[PDB]
Structure formats: structure tokens, C-alpha cells
Amino acid sequence: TEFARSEGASALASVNPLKTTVEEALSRGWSVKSGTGTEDATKKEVPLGVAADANKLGTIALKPDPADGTADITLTFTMGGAGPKNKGKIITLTRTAADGLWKCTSDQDEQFIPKGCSR
């Protein structure tokens, strides 16, 4: 009876919005850093603005942290709070620095990978 399908959707919905946050910072030549806070004008770092534990299905992470746009970026949702099918699975959004484009890949069982994401 676990909610494996909606868990995947919820996990993706916690990281998908962050693509916009990342692009906006990079368009200014500011870096992005993990977590919450205020924009740091000394270092020119913009926080993602979301707590790592905002969604109790798991944890949000940024790599590299901080990220300046000159290397590939990942946003991961690690489903440590999920039920048995999804626990220990990770949804990764990867922004390739060479082209500025995003992809979504997941190590979930393929039945539960959300729309737009691949293995």
C-alpha cells in the first residue's frame, strides 16, 4: 500500500523548481550555494532557498557547492524518508555545463521513475 508513484512525483517536485533558481543566479555571474539564507554580496553566492529537509521524503543536495556554472551541476533528491520501494533511491537533475541543458535521471525501479526522467 505504499505511495511509490506519488513519492517520486513529490521528490521531483522538490528539485525541479531549483533549476530556475540556478539559472537566474548563473545569468548574473553569481554562484549558487546550498541551503537557505540571504544572497551573499561579498562572495556573490545565492542560496538555493530551500532547506535540505523541506520534503520529509528525503534530502536535497547541490554539487558542487557552491556552483559557478563552469562545471556540471547536480541537484539530487535522495529518498531516505520514502517507503520500501523508493527508500535509498535518488533522483538526479544534471545541468551539463558545456551546453547549459538539464536532464533528469533516476535509480528508482523503472516503474516509478517520473515523467521526463530516464534511467
Coordinates of N, CA and C in Angstrom, one line a residue:
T1 N 0.7 -1.2 0.0 CA 0.0 0.0 0.0 C 0.8 1.3 0.0
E2 N 2.1 1.2 -0.2 CA 2.9 2.4 -0.2 C 2.6 3.3 -1.4
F3 N 2.8 4.6 -1.2 CA 2.6 5.6 -2.2 C 3.7 5.8 -3.2
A4 N 4.3 4.7 -3.8 CA 5.5 4.8 -4.5 C 5.4 5.8 -5.7
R5 N 4.3 5.9 -6.4 CA 4.2 6.8 -7.5 C 4.2 8.2 -7.1
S6 N 3.4 8.6 -6.1 CA 3.3 10.0 -5.7 C 4.6 10.4 -5.0
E7 N 5.3 9.5 -4.3 CA 6.6 9.8 -3.7 C 7.5 10.3 -4.8
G8 N 7.6 9.6 -5.9 CA 8.5 10.0 -7.0 C 8.2 11.4 -7.5
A9 N 6.8 11.7 -7.7 CA 6.4 12.9 -8.2 C 6.8 14.0 -7.2
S10 N 6.5 13.8 -5.9 CA 6.8 14.7 -4.8 C 8.3 15.0 -4.8
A11 N 9.2 14.0 -4.8 CA 10.6 14.2 -4.8 C 11.1 15.1 -6.0
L12 N 10.6 14.7 -7.2 CA 11.0 15.6 -8.4 C 10.5 17.0 -8.2
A13 N 9.3 17.2 -7.6 CA 8.7 18.5 -7.4 C 9.5 19.3 -6.4
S14 N 10.3 18.7 -5.6 CA 11.2 19.5 -4.7 C 12.5 20.0 -5.3
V15 N 12.9 19.3 -6.4 CA 14.1 19.8 -7.0 C 13.9 20.5 -8.4
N16 N 12.8 20.1 -9.1 CA 12.6 20.8 -10.4 C 12.5 22.3 -10.3
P17 N 11.9 22.9 -9.3 CA 11.9 24.4 -9.3 C 13.3 25.0 -9.2
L18 N 14.2 24.3 -8.6 CA 15.5 24.8 -8.3 C 16.3 25.0 -9.6
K19 N 15.9 24.4 -10.7 CA 16.6 24.7 -12.0 C 16.5 26.2 -12.3
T20 N 15.3 26.8 -12.0 CA 15.1 28.2 -12.3 C 16.0 29.0 -11.4
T21 N 16.1 28.7 -10.1 CA 16.9 29.4 -9.2 C 18.4 29.4 -9.6
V22 N 18.8 28.2 -10.1 CA 20.2 28.1 -10.5 C 20.4 29.0 -11.8
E23 N 19.5 28.9 -12.8 CA 19.7 29.6 -14.0 C 19.8 31.1 -13.7
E24 N 18.9 31.6 -12.8 CA 18.8 33.0 -12.6 C 20.2 33.5 -11.9
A25 N 20.7 32.7 -11.0 CA 22.0 33.1 -10.4 C 23.1 33.1 -11.4
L26 N 23.2 32.1 -12.2 CA 24.2 32.0 -13.2 C 24.1 33.1 -14.2
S27 N 22.9 33.5 -14.6 CA 22.8 34.6 -15.6 C 23.4 35.9 -15.1
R28 N 23.5 36.1 -13.8 CA 24.2 37.2 -13.2 C 25.6 37.0 -13.0
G29 N 26.2 35.8 -13.2 CA 27.5 35.6 -12.8 C 27.8 35.4 -11.3
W30 N 26.6 35.1 -10.6 CA 26.7 34.7 -9.2 C 26.7 33.2 -9.2
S31 N 27.3 32.7 -8.1 CA 27.3 31.2 -7.8 C 26.0 30.9 -7.0
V32 N 25.7 29.6 -7.0 CA 24.6 29.1 -6.1 C 25.3 28.3 -5.0
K33 N 24.7 28.4 -3.8 CA 25.1 27.6 -2.7 C 23.9 26.9 -2.1
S34 N 24.2 25.8 -1.4 CA 23.1 25.0 -0.8 C 22.4 25.8 0.4
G35 N 21.2 25.4 0.6 CA 20.5 25.8 1.8 C 19.8 27.1 1.7
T36 N 19.5 27.6 2.8 CA 18.7 28.8 2.9 C 19.6 30.0 3.4
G37 N 19.1 31.2 3.3 CA 19.8 32.4 3.7 C 19.5 33.5 2.8
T38 N 20.4 34.5 2.9 CA 20.4 35.7 2.0 C 21.5 35.6 1.0
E39 N 21.3 36.3 -0.1 CA 22.3 36.4 -1.1 C 23.6 37.1 -0.5
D40 N 24.7 36.5 -0.7 CA 26.0 37.0 -0.1 C 26.7 37.8 -1.1
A41 N 26.6 39.1 -1.0 CA 27.2 40.1 -1.9 C 28.7 40.1 -1.8
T42 N 29.3 39.6 -0.8 CA 30.8 39.5 -0.7 C 31.3 38.4 -1.6
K43 N 30.8 37.3 -1.6 CA 31.2 36.1 -2.4 C 30.4 36.0 -3.6
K44 N 29.3 36.8 -3.8 CA 28.4 36.6 -4.9 C 27.8 35.2 -5.0
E45 N 27.2 34.8 -3.9 CA 26.6 33.5 -3.8 C 25.1 33.6 -3.4
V46 N 24.3 33.0 -4.2 CA 22.8 32.9 -4.0 C 22.5 31.6 -3.3
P47 N 21.8 31.6 -2.2 CA 21.3 30.3 -1.7 C 20.2 29.7 -2.5
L48 N 20.1 28.4 -2.6 CA 19.0 27.8 -3.3 C 17.7 28.2 -2.7
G49 N 17.7 28.4 -1.4 CA 16.5 29.0 -0.7 C 15.6 27.9 -0.1
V50 N 15.9 26.7 -0.2 CA 15.1 25.5 0.3 C 16.0 24.8 1.3
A51 N 15.3 24.4 2.4 CA 16.0 23.6 3.4 C 16.2 22.2 2.8
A52 N 17.3 21.6 3.2 CA 17.7 20.3 2.7 C 16.6 19.2 3.0
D53 N 15.9 19.4 4.1 CA 14.9 18.6 4.7 C 13.5 19.1 4.5
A54 N 13.3 20.0 3.5 CA 12.0 20.6 3.3 C 10.9 19.6 3.0
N55 N 11.2 18.5 2.3 CA 10.3 17.4 2.0 C 10.7 16.2 2.8
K56 N 9.8 15.7 3.6 CA 10.1 14.7 4.5 C 10.3 13.3 3.9
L57 N 10.1 13.2 2.6 CA 10.5 12.0 1.8 C 12.0 11.9 1.7
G58 N 12.8 13.0 2.0 CA 14.3 12.8 1.8 C 15.0 14.1 1.9
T59 N 16.1 14.1 1.2 CA 17.0 15.3 1.3 C 17.5 15.8 0.0
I60 N 17.6 17.1 -0.1 CA 18.0 17.8 -1.3 C 19.5 18.2 -1.2
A61 N 20.3 17.9 -2.2 CA 21.7 18.3 -2.2 C 22.1 18.9 -3.6
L62 N 23.0 19.8 -3.5 CA 23.7 20.5 -4.6 C 25.1 20.1 -4.7
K63 N 25.6 19.8 -5.9 CA 27.0 19.6 -6.1 C 27.4 20.3 -7.5
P64 N 28.6 20.9 -7.6 CA 29.4 21.3 -6.5 C 28.7 22.4 -5.6
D65 N 29.2 22.6 -4.4 CA 28.6 23.6 -3.5 C 29.7 24.4 -2.9
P66 N 29.8 25.7 -3.4 CA 29.0 26.4 -4.3 C 29.3 26.0 -5.8
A67 N 28.4 26.4 -6.7 CA 28.5 26.1 -8.1 C 28.5 27.4 -8.9
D68 N 29.4 27.6 -9.8 CA 29.6 28.8 -10.5 C 29.2 28.7 -12.0
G69 N 28.7 27.5 -12.4 CA 28.3 27.4 -13.8 C 29.4 26.9 -14.8
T70 N 30.6 26.8 -14.3 CA 31.7 26.4 -15.1 C 32.0 24.9 -15.0
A71 N 31.2 24.1 -14.3 CA 31.2 22.7 -14.2 C 29.9 22.1 -14.1
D72 N 29.7 20.9 -14.4 CA 28.4 20.2 -14.3 C 27.8 20.4 -12.9
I73 N 26.5 20.6 -12.8 CA 25.8 20.8 -11.6 C 24.8 19.6 -11.4
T74 N 24.7 19.1 -10.2 CA 23.6 18.2 -9.9 C 22.8 18.7 -8.7
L75 N 21.5 18.5 -8.9 CA 20.5 18.7 -7.8 C 20.0 17.3 -7.6
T76 N 20.1 16.7 -6.4 CA 19.6 15.4 -6.1 C 18.5 15.5 -5.0
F77 N 17.6 14.5 -5.2 CA 16.6 14.3 -4.1 C 16.9 12.8 -3.7
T78 N 17.4 12.6 -2.5 CA 17.7 11.3 -2.0 C 16.6 10.8 -1.1
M79 N 15.9 9.8 -1.5 CA 14.6 9.4 -0.9 C 14.7 8.6 0.4
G80 N 15.5 9.1 1.4 CA 15.7 8.4 2.6 C 14.4 8.3 3.5
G81 N 13.4 9.1 3.3 CA 12.2 9.1 4.0 C 11.1 8.3 3.4
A82 N 11.3 7.7 2.2 CA 10.3 7.0 1.5 C 10.0 5.6 2.0
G83 N 8.9 5.1 1.4 CA 8.6 3.7 1.7 C 9.6 2.7 1.0
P84 N 9.3 1.4 1.2 CA 10.3 0.4 0.8 C 10.7 0.4 -0.7
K85 N 9.8 0.7 -1.6 CA 10.2 0.6 -3.0 C 11.2 1.8 -3.4
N86 N 11.0 3.0 -2.8 CA 11.8 4.1 -3.2 C 12.9 4.5 -2.1
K87 N 12.9 3.8 -0.9 CA 13.9 4.2 0.0 C 15.3 3.9 -0.6
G88 N 16.2 4.8 -0.3 CA 17.5 4.6 -0.9 C 17.7 4.9 -2.3
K89 N 16.7 5.4 -3.0 CA 16.7 5.8 -4.4 C 16.9 7.3 -4.5
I90 N 17.5 7.7 -5.6 CA 18.0 9.0 -5.8 C 17.5 9.5 -7.2
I91 N 16.9 10.7 -7.3 CA 16.6 11.4 -8.5 C 17.6 12.5 -8.7
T92 N 18.3 12.5 -9.8 CA 19.3 13.5 -10.1 C 18.9 14.4 -11.3
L93 N 19.0 15.7 -11.1 CA 18.9 16.7 -12.2 C 20.3 17.1 -12.5
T94 N 20.8 16.9 -13.7 CA 22.1 17.3 -14.1 C 22.1 18.4 -15.1
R95 N 22.7 19.5 -14.8 CA 22.9 20.6 -15.7 C 24.3 20.4 -16.3
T96 N 24.4 20.1 -17.6 CA 25.7 20.0 -18.2 C 26.2 21.4 -18.5
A97 N 27.4 21.7 -18.0 CA 28.0 23.0 -18.1 C 28.4 23.3 -19.6
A98 N 28.6 22.3 -20.4 CA 29.0 22.6 -21.8 C 27.9 23.2 -22.6
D99 N 26.7 22.8 -22.3 CA 25.6 23.3 -23.1 C 24.5 24.0 -22.3
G100 N 24.6 24.0 -21.0 CA 23.6 24.6 -20.2 C 22.3 23.9 -20.1
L101 N 22.2 22.7 -20.5 CA 21.0 21.9 -20.6 C 20.8 21.0 -19.3
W102 N 19.6 20.6 -19.1 CA 19.2 19.8 -18.0 C 18.7 18.5 -18.4
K103 N 19.0 17.4 -17.6 CA 18.4 16.1 -17.8 C 18.0 15.6 -16.4
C104 N 17.1 14.7 -16.3 CA 16.7 14.0 -15.1 C 16.9 12.5 -15.2
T105 N 17.7 12.0 -14.3 CA 17.9 10.5 -14.3 C 17.6 10.0 -12.9
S106 N 17.2 8.8 -12.8 CA 16.8 8.2 -11.5 C 17.2 6.8 -11.5
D107 N 17.6 6.3 -10.2 CA 17.9 4.9 -10.0 C 16.8 4.2 -9.3
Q108 N 15.6 4.8 -9.3 CA 14.4 4.1 -8.9 C 14.1 2.9 -9.8
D109 N 13.3 1.9 -9.3 CA 12.8 0.9 -10.2 C 12.0 1.6 -11.3
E110 N 12.1 1.1 -12.5 CA 11.7 1.9 -13.7 C 10.3 2.2 -13.6
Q111 N 9.4 1.3 -13.0 CA 8.0 1.5 -12.8 C 7.7 2.9 -12.2
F112 N 8.6 3.4 -11.4 CA 8.3 4.6 -10.6 C 9.0 5.9 -11.0
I113 N 9.8 5.8 -12.1 CA 10.6 7.0 -12.5 C 9.6 8.0 -13.0
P114 N 9.7 9.3 -12.6 CA 8.7 10.3 -13.0 C 8.9 10.7 -14.5
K115 N 7.8 11.3 -15.0 CA 7.7 11.8 -16.3 C 8.9 12.8 -16.6
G116 N 9.6 12.5 -17.7 CA 10.7 13.4 -18.1 C 12.1 12.9 -17.7
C117 N 12.1 11.9 -16.8 CA 13.3 11.3 -16.2 C 13.6 9.9 -16.9
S118 N 14.8 9.6 -17.0 CA 15.3 8.3 -17.5 C 16.1 7.6 -16.5
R119 N 16.4 6.3 -16.8 CA 17.5 5.6 -16.1 C 18.8 6.3 -16.4

